[PDB]
Amino acid sequence: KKPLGKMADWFRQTLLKKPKK
Numbered sequence: 001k002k003p004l005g006k007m008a009d010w011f012r013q014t015l016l017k018k019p020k021k
Contacts, residue, residue: 012018 009020013020
């Protein structure tokens with residue numbers, strides 16, 4: 001998994017309020 005994809009999910013949880021799963 002690319003760090004970029006990891007950060008993408010990080011933003012999805014952080015900003016879009018979508019818990020990673």
